[PDB]
């Protein structure tokens, strides 16, 4: 999900 890039990991 995009939540993986929400922080940049």
From Swiss-Prot:
GO terms for cellular component: extracellular space. Keywords: Antimicrobial, Plant defense, Secreted. One of its GO terms (biological process) is defense response to Gram-positive bacterium. Found in the liquid endosperm contained in green fruit of coconut palms, also known as coconut water (at protein level). It is found in: Secreted, Extracellular space. Disulfide bonds: none annotated. It comes from the Eukaryota. Has antimicrobial activity against Gram-positive bacteria B.subtilis (MIC=76 ug/ml) and S.aureus (MIC=80 ug/ml), and against Gram-negative bacteria E.coli (MIC=82 ug/ml) and P.aeruginosa (MIC=79 ug/ml). Monomer. This is Antimicrobial peptide 1. It comes from Cocos nucifera.
